[PDB]
Amino acid sequence: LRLTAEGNKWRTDILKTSVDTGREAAAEVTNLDKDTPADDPELLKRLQEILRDNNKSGILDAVTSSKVNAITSQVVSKCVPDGTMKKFPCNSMQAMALSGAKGSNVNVSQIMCLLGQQALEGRRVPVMVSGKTLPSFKPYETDAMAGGYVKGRFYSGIKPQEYYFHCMAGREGLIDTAVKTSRSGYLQRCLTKQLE
Amino acid sequence: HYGIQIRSVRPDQTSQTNVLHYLNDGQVTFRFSWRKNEYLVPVVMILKALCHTSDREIFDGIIGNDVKDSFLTDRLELLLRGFKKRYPHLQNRTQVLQYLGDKFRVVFQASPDQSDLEVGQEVLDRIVLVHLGKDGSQDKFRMLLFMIRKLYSLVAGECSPDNPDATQHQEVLLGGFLYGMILKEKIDEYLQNIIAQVRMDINRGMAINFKDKRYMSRVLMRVNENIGS
Amino acid sequence: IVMTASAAIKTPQMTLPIWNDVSDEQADTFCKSISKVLLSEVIDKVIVTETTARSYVIHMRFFDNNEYSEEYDVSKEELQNVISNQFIHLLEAAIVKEIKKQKRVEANNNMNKVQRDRQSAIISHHRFITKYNFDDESGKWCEFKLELAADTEKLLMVNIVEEICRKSIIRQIPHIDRCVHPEPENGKRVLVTEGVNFQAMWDQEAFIDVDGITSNDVAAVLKTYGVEAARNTIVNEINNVFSRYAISVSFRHLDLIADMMTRQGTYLAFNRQGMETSTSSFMKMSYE
Amino acid sequence: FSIPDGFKKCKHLKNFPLNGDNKQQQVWLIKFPSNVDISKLKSLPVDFESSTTMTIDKHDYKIMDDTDNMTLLVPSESKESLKIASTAPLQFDKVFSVSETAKIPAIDYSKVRVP
Amino acid sequence: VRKLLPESWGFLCPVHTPDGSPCGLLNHFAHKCRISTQQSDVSRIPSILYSLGVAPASHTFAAGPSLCCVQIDGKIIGWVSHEQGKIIADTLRYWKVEGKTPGLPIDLEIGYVPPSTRGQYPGLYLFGGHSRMLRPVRYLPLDKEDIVGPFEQVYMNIAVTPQEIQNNVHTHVEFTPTNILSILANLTPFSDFNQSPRNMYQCQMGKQTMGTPGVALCHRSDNKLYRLQ
Amino acid sequence: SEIEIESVQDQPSVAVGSFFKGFRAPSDTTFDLYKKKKSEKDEFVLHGENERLEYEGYTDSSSQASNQYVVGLFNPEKKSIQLYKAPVLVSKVVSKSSKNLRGPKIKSKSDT
Amino acid sequence: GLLNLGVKDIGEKVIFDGKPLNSEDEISNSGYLGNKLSVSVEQVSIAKPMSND
Amino acid sequence: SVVGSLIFCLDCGDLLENPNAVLGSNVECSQCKAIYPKSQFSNLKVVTTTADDAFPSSLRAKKSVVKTSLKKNELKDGATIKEKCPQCGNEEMNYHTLQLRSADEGATVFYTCTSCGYKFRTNN
Amino acid sequence: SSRHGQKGVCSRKWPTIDMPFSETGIQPDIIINPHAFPSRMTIGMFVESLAGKAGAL
Ligand SMILES: [Zn+2]
Ligand SMILES: [Zn+2]
């Protein structure tokens, strides 16, 4: 489960280019430009305007999620065959994923590289009334991390802020399971009386 | 769909909810659940019943400033004119309570000696904003006028709705606090069984002298008093 | 589809295959000539001054004429005919309805003969409008004065006007809310219509292959095209559900579900109401 | 009148010389908290701006101004009567407010964030 | 209502909730989450707010979102500006954790809601009653423990670790980031490396073990006990 | 930028009425200034009367032990004030006509 | 405590007799109800568990 | 005192009735028998603009100052993982993980290819 | 079950001798399948396994 020190420098340098990603997607949806700084009062006014609308927050989520999924796809596509310490036959974690024995290449990427964007009900991490996604962050923070982008992996650990968003994504996969089977159970019963 | 919901608790941890609805007429109603029913009195009936008010004290308490704010001064005279039109026979405080004690007389189990301005005083001291207690009628008057500039500031969209699920607008009803709430309403049912037992005796004329120590003993050996079970 | 046999689908659509000699600009121009345009979609503000017999000077602010004629293809000669034939009639049908349930910048004047004759005729056609003017030069404002009686009490006029502006249509082909030009999937230049009206799209043969138009409202393919076309829609719409989730089901199952739902020539569900026409009593008793 | 107990009417109503010429006399409505003595203080530092930090007895106060209702009452002649001051109502010329302040300390960032 | 929200930070455990049908409805408290039992002395606070810039509510007669209503326990006591009310909320927190004012209890919460555009209705809301959720954080001037409730927490800036204290935004810091988990969710070894449904599932599997119910088993008589030897 | 003080009048001679906005009270009116005799920050009661109206006020019980107001009289030429420690009276207005009331019960009922 | 603070929110449950006053034919001889009660509780005390027979 | 369309008594502060609803040349309060037999103020105007978010449209959204809609091809998916597409041989593939079952089963990945667009699904 | 949600029934009380034995002679009390961990992502159990053996020594 360990990347080699050559390849572990690779995921640092690509994740070094993600600190600007949150503002640039937020500067794009506000129709500003020129790398206006995050503390711009004419920027923070527009982010509050976006916050009160369910439409405009859907746009800012979709722009910023698809922009940070690129950095997620650059770290994986550079590391997981190449940056690992043990290569394929001896690396049983990959051989369980390549053979189809158990797991996928997504499980191997979240262990070795990073978790990625914690998408909640399709959109992104929810937000308070004050423009704060947690009490740890500045209100109307245009950080990618503040929106729920986990730059940590399960090999090395996830920070307390991004451990809280990952429990949000963990629970929506469990409340949706409890409401899963009751839906399609009655659809099948109802077919098997006519077509019976 | 609009409204202002408050949950007022007494100093004995017993609660009371007073919801403040917005109609599409400029009309605002006051909602409360007394026994298990649910009653709907207009708001300027209460605002004129709590303390001695003019119709400009009600105006200034809502329109503090921004007289030029045209949204507020037009919703409001469908609420001050709507009371003067519908209730022209209610001029001062000691006559709206006569009206308010008359309609609610049956439901609060009022005695035949209580005057209507004593029954209506009890309704205002048992339901509306019970976290300010009795003799805080000025403070109960200023809180409703605050709760109308929250309702009118929400129909205009100057205020997001408060989320009732979001852990800032909710607190924890504890274990023993619930246990003392229910224990109060068992000894309230216990006094009401003493009265319902004596009224059975005065349907007859058997032996009723309320100054007698041995008639009190006969009543209370007939009322079930095992609250502990 | 399967349960309840919804004749009112929540999101009914319609896929319109355009020709191969209609351009992308003439497609996007054709989109704007279909989508409905409320009167609320060309208004910046509505300023209503109530003075007190009673009066109500309703002043409208439209957007600039080079903005709603480009976004909605609406000329200022349309707004004259929309307001003075549809809006003021609907407005007075709400003011009278409320009173019956109650008693239980610049300045422009010196009109010519055209504007004067427009004014006095519409005053005769209506009940209490008494003054009327519309910006004929720039198409930026309308202007009229509802005088009610000298007896009526306070009326929330701005709440009345907002509900009527959002219900007066300038240009609506019926049952059709919006047309859109999506990305061409595998070279299929098509148009997606939020709503179903097959009868209207036949009149648009200069832009549409009308023998290739495709919906997902099965109860509306059934009414227009018949029972075998509706049956072909069911096997295509159950397939679109499973092919989205990359789930392969065989068409032999989907043809037998579809040929059960179309066994009476109608579009019958799997529920009590679809089961009502059957022979077996104990099948029905055991169901619900 | 004077139905509740403890209440005696006022007699020795001292003179309030509201002259009103035209030089001029201005009537003010300044406030004070309970942590100040009126008769001890000599000079009243004031400005049309707010930056008016008055320091009394190891406290720091703040005189706030506001230009943009309350009614003044003055005695009649000698019998009390408290008649309304007017012209021929009457507002105040200036209103102020003295507020107790407190100095929050700056956060010692060189100490409170340890690596 | 099953949705995990950010306002439950430090008050409800994000992990320790049972999988299945009561998922999200049966959430547990955090580690250091105390709940007020008696109400605190707030008879002396209006003497302190009037010493600050609060104009009294009975003379002023103002209303609206353009000013900052000042309420203690749901009793409107005064009115300030929005700029003046922010200074009052900070001084009341400064005099609180510095235990020298003889009227301010530390379990008071100062719920300042700043003005905004179409946000929550502004005001300054003090609470001192029973039943409030409360958790400790470190106030960054004076380096002292502060007590913060969930109405306050939405508008604060509480750093998670002291290494993440940014200049001139953070006023508080957590003592330890493990003050936000439950008791049972905090005993899972290296819980920050597991996947999130697996930390949630241990919290349910940790209840259902056979361990040691107690040592005084020869003086009890239960239906069944499971005892790992 | 200081301003000196002529004198500090501690004795009660000026009161500040707090009526509703837009209050006339015609000029031939007399107001009584009552006073609790306890010699600290004192609780007053106003009362006045004319032929059609009657209206009383009082110092508010919450603030007047904690918040003191002073009416100053300012001279711009001598650059000084003189101070008059005034109370503020939360003042209502009743009418001498609308003090009627109906029967204390329904007075005719024997049905429950 | 909250119990003794809660028994003073219920302090009046009253009834009357149906017996008259038996004076002359007067105006208070027509409106007399009877003699009032006020059954009420002013102190409640939970003791501690003990053993009694 | 004329406040908007409301006129109050300058003695008792009560709401006077509408001067166009009483009979001729007298308005007077119910409590204070007022001294207004005049109907002095003829025009009482109240200019009432509509709310700025009362008419939602696509043209008001362009008159807003932020990006209200996504364009037709100005948001591409960032997710890519090099799995071989079994229909055309493409390597780039947009993945999509949503959690189906309870806390006894992991995540299930949706594989949508880039060029062709064939939907593919891998269970575990 | 371990402390990571890795539960599963005892499939066979496997006899001692035909169970793999270390260099030290130690034979494991519990054999757990490595094919659990790819879909579970319980890496707290790998480092608990690694910190527990450090702590015993
Ligand atoms: Zn009057
Ligand atoms: Zn492909």
mmCIF file of C-alpha atoms in Angstrom, chain C:
data_model
loop_
_atom_site.group_PDB
_atom_site.id
_atom_site.type_symbol
_atom_site.label_atom_id
_atom_site.label_comp_id
_atom_site.label_asym_id
_atom_site.label_seq_id
_atom_site.Cartn_x
_atom_site.Cartn_y
_atom_site.Cartn_z
ATOM 1 C CA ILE C 1 -44.487 3.672 -17.032
ATOM 2 C CA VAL C 2 -45.038 0.287 -15.426
ATOM 3 C CA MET C 3 -46.952 1.283 -12.319
ATOM 4 C CA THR C 4 -49.845 3.790 -12.294
ATOM 5 C CA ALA C 5 -49.852 4.354 -16.132
ATOM 6 C CA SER C 6 -49.244 8.068 -15.764
ATOM 7 C CA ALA C 7 -51.042 10.122 -18.373
ATOM 8 C CA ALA C 8 -49.412 13.133 -16.688
ATOM 9 C CA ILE C 9 -45.691 12.377 -16.607
ATOM 10 C CA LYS C 10 -43.784 14.839 -14.425
ATOM 11 C CA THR C 11 -41.274 15.678 -17.200
ATOM 12 C CA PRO C 12 -42.781 14.874 -20.615
ATOM 13 C CA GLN C 13 -40.497 15.493 -23.554
ATOM 14 C CA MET C 14 -40.391 15.370 -27.337
ATOM 15 C CA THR C 15 -37.402 14.823 -29.618
ATOM 16 C CA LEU C 16 -37.604 16.723 -32.903
ATOM 17 C CA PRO C 17 -35.214 15.668 -35.684
ATOM 18 C CA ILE C 18 -34.354 18.734 -37.725
ATOM 19 C CA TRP C 19 -33.398 18.406 -41.371
ATOM 20 C CA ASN C 20 -29.921 18.363 -42.867
ATOM 21 C CA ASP C 21 -30.326 21.740 -44.616
ATOM 22 C CA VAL C 22 -31.461 23.830 -41.640
ATOM 23 C CA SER C 23 -28.483 25.571 -40.069
ATOM 24 C CA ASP C 24 -27.507 25.820 -36.418
ATOM 25 C CA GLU C 25 -28.515 29.486 -36.340
ATOM 26 C CA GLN C 26 -31.863 28.656 -37.944
ATOM 27 C CA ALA C 27 -32.210 25.905 -35.352
ATOM 28 C CA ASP C 28 -31.539 28.286 -32.457
ATOM 29 C CA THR C 29 -33.887 30.806 -34.046
ATOM 30 C CA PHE C 30 -36.510 28.059 -34.267
ATOM 31 C CA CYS C 31 -36.071 27.300 -30.560
ATOM 32 C CA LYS C 32 -37.099 30.824 -29.597
ATOM 33 C CA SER C 33 -40.192 30.708 -31.821
ATOM 34 C CA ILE C 34 -41.631 27.791 -29.829
ATOM 35 C CA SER C 35 -40.877 28.433 -26.149
ATOM 36 C CA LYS C 36 -43.572 30.257 -24.242
ATOM 37 C CA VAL C 37 -43.065 33.870 -23.216
ATOM 38 C CA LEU C 38 -44.908 35.137 -20.167
ATOM 39 C CA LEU C 39 -45.579 38.835 -19.769
ATOM 40 C CA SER C 40 -43.442 38.550 -16.624
ATOM 41 C CA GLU C 41 -40.412 37.773 -18.776
ATOM 42 C CA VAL C 42 -40.119 41.262 -20.295
ATOM 43 C CA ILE C 43 -40.741 43.340 -17.148
ATOM 44 C CA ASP C 44 -38.025 45.049 -15.151
ATOM 45 C CA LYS C 45 -40.309 46.666 -12.558
ATOM 46 C CA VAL C 46 -43.949 47.531 -11.933
ATOM 47 C CA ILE C 47 -44.425 50.776 -9.998
ATOM 48 C CA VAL C 48 -47.971 51.169 -8.667
ATOM 49 C CA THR C 49 -48.892 54.477 -7.021
ATOM 50 C CA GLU C 50 -52.159 54.389 -5.077
ATOM 51 C CA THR C 51 -53.582 57.837 -4.424
ATOM 52 C CA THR C 52 -56.911 58.618 -2.812
ATOM 53 C CA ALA C 53 -62.040 58.776 -5.592
ATOM 54 C CA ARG C 54 -59.448 55.989 -5.532
ATOM 55 C CA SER C 55 -56.763 55.601 -8.178
ATOM 56 C CA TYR C 56 -53.974 53.221 -9.158
ATOM 57 C CA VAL C 57 -51.355 54.476 -11.602
ATOM 58 C CA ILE C 58 -49.731 51.224 -12.721
ATOM 59 C CA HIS C 59 -46.420 52.018 -14.400
ATOM 60 C CA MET C 60 -44.414 49.283 -16.084
ATOM 61 C CA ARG C 61 -40.712 49.232 -16.858
ATOM 62 C CA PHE C 62 -39.810 46.823 -19.565
ATOM 63 C CA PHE C 63 -36.322 45.906 -20.525
ATOM 64 C CA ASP C 64 -34.712 47.681 -23.453
ATOM 65 C CA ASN C 65 -36.235 46.864 -26.815
ATOM 66 C CA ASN C 66 -32.952 45.452 -28.103
ATOM 67 C CA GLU C 67 -33.023 42.940 -25.225
ATOM 68 C CA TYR C 68 -36.409 41.237 -25.206
ATOM 69 C CA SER C 69 -36.609 41.263 -28.993
ATOM 70 C CA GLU C 70 -33.315 39.338 -29.014
ATOM 71 C CA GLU C 71 -33.889 36.959 -26.092
ATOM 72 C CA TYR C 72 -37.533 36.207 -26.817
ATOM 73 C CA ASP C 73 -38.121 37.421 -30.421
ATOM 74 C CA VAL C 74 -40.836 39.760 -29.126
ATOM 75 C CA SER C 75 -41.541 43.022 -30.911
ATOM 76 C CA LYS C 76 -43.045 46.036 -29.195
ATOM 77 C CA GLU C 77 -46.095 45.715 -31.431
ATOM 78 C CA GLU C 78 -46.766 42.413 -29.676
ATOM 79 C CA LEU C 79 -46.661 43.870 -26.150
ATOM 80 C CA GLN C 80 -49.201 46.499 -27.167
ATOM 81 C CA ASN C 81 -51.554 43.753 -28.275
ATOM 82 C CA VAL C 82 -50.751 41.512 -25.298
ATOM 83 C CA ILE C 83 -51.353 44.119 -22.598
ATOM 84 C CA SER C 84 -54.341 45.840 -24.178
ATOM 85 C CA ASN C 85 -56.229 42.650 -25.036
ATOM 86 C CA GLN C 86 -55.182 40.075 -22.445
ATOM 87 C CA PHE C 87 -53.548 41.624 -19.378
ATOM 88 C CA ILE C 88 -56.042 44.325 -18.425
ATOM 89 C CA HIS C 89 -58.951 41.906 -18.845
ATOM 90 C CA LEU C 90 -57.268 39.377 -16.550
ATOM 91 C CA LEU C 91 -56.339 42.132 -14.104
ATOM 92 C CA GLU C 92 -59.889 43.381 -13.632
ATOM 93 C CA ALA C 93 -61.125 39.803 -13.294
ATOM 94 C CA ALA C 94 -58.907 39.601 -10.192
ATOM 95 C CA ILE C 95 -59.668 43.025 -8.712
ATOM 96 C CA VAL C 96 -63.436 42.511 -8.931
ATOM 97 C CA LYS C 97 -63.023 38.978 -7.548
ATOM 98 C CA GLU C 98 -61.194 40.365 -4.521
ATOM 99 C CA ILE C 99 -63.692 43.156 -3.763
ATOM 100 C CA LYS C 100 -66.592 40.711 -4.143
ATOM 101 C CA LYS C 101 -64.806 38.625 -1.501
ATOM 102 C CA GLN C 102 -64.309 41.779 0.574
ATOM 103 C CA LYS C 103 -67.770 43.387 0.860
ATOM 104 C CA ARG C 104 -69.673 40.277 1.900
ATOM 105 C CA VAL C 105 -36.805 59.092 -15.328
ATOM 106 C CA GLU C 106 -38.911 61.147 -17.746
ATOM 107 C CA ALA C 107 -42.472 62.284 -18.451
ATOM 108 C CA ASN C 108 -44.358 61.896 -21.726
ATOM 109 C CA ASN C 109 -47.528 63.661 -22.850
ATOM 110 C CA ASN C 110 -48.961 65.417 -25.963
ATOM 111 C CA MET C 111 -50.195 62.314 -27.755
ATOM 112 C CA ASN C 112 -51.069 62.205 -31.438
ATOM 113 C CA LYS C 113 -54.313 60.936 -32.969
ATOM 114 C CA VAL C 114 -53.150 57.301 -33.078
ATOM 115 C CA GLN C 115 -52.321 57.164 -29.369
ATOM 116 C CA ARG C 116 -55.436 59.185 -28.501
ATOM 117 C CA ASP C 117 -57.674 56.802 -30.447
ATOM 118 C CA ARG C 118 -55.907 53.853 -28.840
ATOM 119 C CA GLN C 119 -56.651 55.343 -25.427
ATOM 120 C CA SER C 120 -60.352 56.172 -25.742
ATOM 121 C CA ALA C 121 -61.270 52.903 -27.457
ATOM 122 C CA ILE C 122 -59.713 50.708 -24.766
ATOM 123 C CA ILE C 123 -61.400 52.853 -22.090
ATOM 124 C CA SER C 124 -64.730 51.930 -23.672
ATOM 125 C CA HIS C 125 -63.756 48.255 -23.846
ATOM 126 C CA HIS C 126 -62.879 48.116 -20.143
ATOM 127 C CA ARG C 127 -64.519 49.117 -16.912
ATOM 128 C CA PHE C 128 -62.331 51.517 -14.946
ATOM 129 C CA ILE C 129 -59.060 52.307 -16.795
ATOM 130 C CA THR C 130 -59.813 55.930 -17.884
ATOM 131 C CA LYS C 131 -56.204 56.709 -19.008
ATOM 132 C CA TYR C 132 -53.823 54.545 -21.005
ATOM 133 C CA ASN C 133 -50.500 55.002 -22.747
ATOM 134 C CA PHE C 134 -47.729 52.805 -24.101
ATOM 135 C CA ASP C 135 -44.207 53.672 -25.213
ATOM 136 C CA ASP C 136 -44.499 53.589 -28.981
ATOM 137 C CA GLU C 137 -41.128 55.191 -29.632
ATOM 138 C CA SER C 138 -38.889 52.952 -27.524
ATOM 139 C CA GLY C 139 -41.091 50.222 -26.040
ATOM 140 C CA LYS C 140 -39.898 50.773 -22.490
ATOM 141 C CA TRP C 141 -43.039 51.513 -20.483
ATOM 142 C CA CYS C 142 -46.781 51.113 -20.321
ATOM 143 C CA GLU C 143 -48.958 53.415 -18.261
ATOM 144 C CA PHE C 144 -52.585 53.340 -17.111
ATOM 145 C CA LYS C 145 -54.763 54.457 -14.190
ATOM 146 C CA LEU C 146 -57.275 52.133 -12.548
ATOM 147 C CA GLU C 147 -59.753 54.327 -10.668
ATOM 148 C CA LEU C 148 -61.962 52.246 -8.415
ATOM 149 C CA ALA C 149 -64.917 53.665 -6.502
ATOM 150 C CA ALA C 150 -64.720 56.397 -3.866
ATOM 151 C CA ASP C 151 -65.719 53.794 -1.261
ATOM 152 C CA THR C 152 -63.263 50.888 -1.519
ATOM 153 C CA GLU C 153 -60.758 50.197 1.228
ATOM 154 C CA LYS C 154 -57.103 49.205 1.002
ATOM 155 C CA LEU C 155 -56.149 46.715 -1.694
ATOM 156 C CA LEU C 156 -52.830 44.889 -2.085
ATOM 157 C CA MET C 157 -52.486 45.929 -5.703
ATOM 158 C CA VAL C 158 -48.872 44.847 -6.174
ATOM 159 C CA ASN C 159 -49.688 41.317 -5.028
ATOM 160 C CA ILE C 160 -52.451 41.270 -7.616
ATOM 161 C CA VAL C 161 -50.252 42.511 -10.463
ATOM 162 C CA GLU C 162 -47.416 40.040 -9.823
ATOM 163 C CA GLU C 163 -49.823 37.112 -10.070
ATOM 164 C CA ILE C 164 -51.343 38.381 -13.318
ATOM 165 C CA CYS C 165 -48.039 39.261 -15.003
ATOM 166 C CA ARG C 166 -46.832 35.702 -14.404
ATOM 167 C CA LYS C 167 -49.959 34.246 -16.019
ATOM 168 C CA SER C 168 -50.391 36.370 -19.155
ATOM 169 C CA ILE C 169 -48.636 34.800 -22.132
ATOM 170 C CA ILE C 170 -47.246 36.761 -25.049
ATOM 171 C CA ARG C 171 -46.643 33.806 -27.343
ATOM 172 C CA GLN C 172 -47.432 30.242 -26.280
ATOM 173 C CA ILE C 173 -47.894 27.291 -28.554
ATOM 174 C CA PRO C 174 -50.120 25.162 -26.289
ATOM 175 C CA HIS C 175 -48.841 22.452 -23.907
ATOM 176 C CA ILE C 176 -45.256 23.417 -24.823
ATOM 177 C CA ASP C 177 -43.093 25.146 -22.237
ATOM 178 C CA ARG C 178 -39.587 25.288 -23.689
ATOM 179 C CA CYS C 179 -37.543 24.121 -26.666
ATOM 180 C CA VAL C 180 -33.805 23.515 -26.388
ATOM 181 C CA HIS C 181 -30.973 22.535 -28.738
ATOM 182 C CA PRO C 182 -28.775 19.957 -26.970
ATOM 183 C CA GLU C 183 -25.481 18.383 -27.960
ATOM 184 C CA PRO C 184 -25.900 16.174 -31.056
ATOM 185 C CA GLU C 185 -25.690 12.558 -29.903
ATOM 186 C CA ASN C 186 -23.976 10.523 -32.666
ATOM 187 C CA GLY C 187 -24.714 13.106 -35.334
ATOM 188 C CA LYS C 188 -28.435 13.264 -34.537
ATOM 189 C CA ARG C 189 -29.247 16.948 -34.820
ATOM 190 C CA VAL C 190 -32.406 17.064 -32.690
ATOM 191 C CA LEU C 191 -34.436 19.436 -30.528
ATOM 192 C CA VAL C 192 -35.812 18.574 -27.094
ATOM 193 C CA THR C 193 -39.171 20.083 -26.164
ATOM 194 C CA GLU C 194 -40.332 20.428 -22.557
ATOM 195 C CA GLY C 195 -43.884 19.327 -23.244
ATOM 196 C CA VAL C 196 -45.902 17.297 -25.726
ATOM 197 C CA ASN C 197 -47.993 18.602 -28.606
ATOM 198 C CA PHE C 198 -47.723 16.512 -31.768
ATOM 199 C CA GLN C 199 -50.458 18.468 -33.535
ATOM 200 C CA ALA C 200 -48.503 21.715 -33.421
ATOM 201 C CA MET C 201 -45.162 20.299 -34.576
ATOM 202 C CA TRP C 202 -46.758 19.019 -37.781
ATOM 203 C CA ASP C 203 -47.217 22.658 -38.784
ATOM 204 C CA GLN C 204 -43.426 23.125 -38.502
ATOM 205 C CA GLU C 205 -42.482 20.913 -41.463
ATOM 206 C CA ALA C 206 -40.008 23.471 -42.846
ATOM 207 C CA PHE C 207 -37.652 22.732 -39.945
ATOM 208 C CA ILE C 208 -38.643 19.292 -38.638
ATOM 209 C CA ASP C 209 -38.705 15.763 -39.982
ATOM 210 C CA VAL C 210 -42.244 15.257 -38.692
ATOM 211 C CA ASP C 211 -42.110 11.521 -39.453
ATOM 212 C CA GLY C 212 -39.355 11.030 -36.897
ATOM 213 C CA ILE C 213 -40.607 12.976 -33.897
ATOM 214 C CA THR C 214 -40.317 10.983 -30.703
ATOM 215 C CA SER C 215 -41.787 11.465 -27.258
ATOM 216 C CA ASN C 216 -41.802 9.691 -23.938
ATOM 217 C CA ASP C 217 -45.402 10.506 -22.975
ATOM 218 C CA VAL C 218 -46.831 7.100 -23.813
ATOM 219 C CA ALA C 219 -50.392 8.266 -23.185
ATOM 220 C CA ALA C 220 -49.883 10.990 -25.813
ATOM 221 C CA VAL C 221 -48.303 8.778 -28.449
ATOM 222 C CA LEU C 222 -51.321 6.523 -27.898
ATOM 223 C CA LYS C 223 -53.801 9.323 -28.498
ATOM 224 C CA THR C 224 -52.159 10.637 -31.669
ATOM 225 C CA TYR C 225 -50.376 7.704 -33.290
ATOM 226 C CA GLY C 226 -52.159 4.649 -31.889
ATOM 227 C CA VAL C 227 -51.552 1.513 -29.904
ATOM 228 C CA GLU C 228 -48.634 -0.053 -31.790
ATOM 229 C CA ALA C 229 -46.690 3.199 -31.686
ATOM 230 C CA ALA C 230 -47.311 3.482 -27.950
ATOM 231 C CA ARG C 231 -46.162 -0.112 -27.530
ATOM 232 C CA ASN C 232 -42.942 0.771 -29.351
ATOM 233 C CA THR C 233 -42.510 3.674 -26.948
ATOM 234 C CA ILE C 234 -42.806 1.482 -23.840
ATOM 235 C CA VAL C 235 -40.025 -0.848 -24.953
ATOM 236 C CA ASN C 236 -37.890 2.197 -25.720
ATOM 237 C CA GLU C 237 -38.567 3.925 -22.418
ATOM 238 C CA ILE C 238 -38.046 0.966 -20.134
ATOM 239 C CA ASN C 239 -34.844 0.425 -22.105
ATOM 240 C CA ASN C 240 -33.678 3.999 -21.473
ATOM 241 C CA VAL C 241 -33.966 3.432 -17.728
ATOM 242 C CA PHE C 242 -31.771 0.332 -17.704
ATOM 243 C CA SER C 243 -29.284 1.463 -20.348
ATOM 244 C CA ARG C 244 -28.501 4.522 -18.240
ATOM 245 C CA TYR C 245 -27.319 2.337 -15.349
ATOM 246 C CA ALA C 246 -25.455 0.011 -17.781
ATOM 247 C CA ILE C 247 -27.889 -2.810 -16.988
ATOM 248 C CA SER C 248 -28.729 -5.131 -19.860
ATOM 249 C CA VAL C 249 -32.178 -6.676 -19.890
ATOM 250 C CA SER C 250 -33.346 -8.641 -22.876
ATOM 251 C CA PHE C 251 -35.961 -7.193 -25.191
ATOM 252 C CA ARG C 252 -38.012 -10.373 -24.956
ATOM 253 C CA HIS C 253 -38.959 -9.431 -21.404
ATOM 254 C CA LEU C 254 -39.702 -5.855 -22.390
ATOM 255 C CA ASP C 255 -41.865 -6.903 -25.329
ATOM 256 C CA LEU C 256 -43.955 -9.115 -23.069
ATOM 257 C CA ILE C 257 -44.434 -6.360 -20.512
ATOM 258 C CA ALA C 258 -45.418 -3.998 -23.324
ATOM 259 C CA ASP C 259 -47.780 -6.475 -24.971
ATOM 260 C CA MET C 260 -49.525 -6.966 -21.637
ATOM 261 C CA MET C 261 -50.031 -3.243 -21.088
ATOM 262 C CA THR C 262 -51.469 -2.847 -24.587
ATOM 263 C CA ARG C 263 -53.699 -5.918 -24.509
ATOM 264 C CA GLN C 264 -56.936 -3.907 -24.659
ATOM 265 C CA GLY C 265 -55.836 -1.324 -27.204
ATOM 266 C CA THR C 266 -55.340 1.078 -24.295
ATOM 267 C CA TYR C 267 -52.424 1.769 -21.965
ATOM 268 C CA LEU C 268 -53.223 -0.283 -18.872
ATOM 269 C CA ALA C 269 -51.108 -0.299 -15.747
ATOM 270 C CA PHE C 270 -50.020 -2.880 -13.269
ATOM 271 C CA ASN C 271 -52.304 -1.780 -10.404
ATOM 272 C CA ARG C 272 -55.885 -2.321 -9.239
ATOM 273 C CA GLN C 273 -57.378 -0.282 -12.061
ATOM 274 C CA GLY C 274 -55.512 -2.194 -14.745
ATOM 275 C CA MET C 275 -56.452 -5.490 -13.093
ATOM 276 C CA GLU C 276 -60.159 -4.548 -12.958
ATOM 277 C CA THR C 277 -60.752 -6.063 -16.396
ATOM 278 C CA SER C 278 -59.798 -9.669 -15.718
ATOM 279 C CA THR C 279 -61.408 -13.076 -15.307
ATOM 280 C CA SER C 280 -59.794 -14.493 -12.163
ATOM 281 C CA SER C 281 -61.556 -13.266 -9.042
ATOM 282 C CA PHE C 282 -59.077 -14.822 -6.618
ATOM 283 C CA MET C 283 -56.157 -13.102 -8.342
ATOM 284 C CA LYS C 284 -57.846 -9.790 -7.594
ATOM 285 C CA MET C 285 -58.870 -10.698 -4.036
ATOM 286 C CA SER C 286 -55.350 -11.811 -3.169
ATOM 287 C CA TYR C 287 -53.749 -8.637 -4.491
ATOM 288 C CA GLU C 288 -55.389 -5.812 -2.498
#
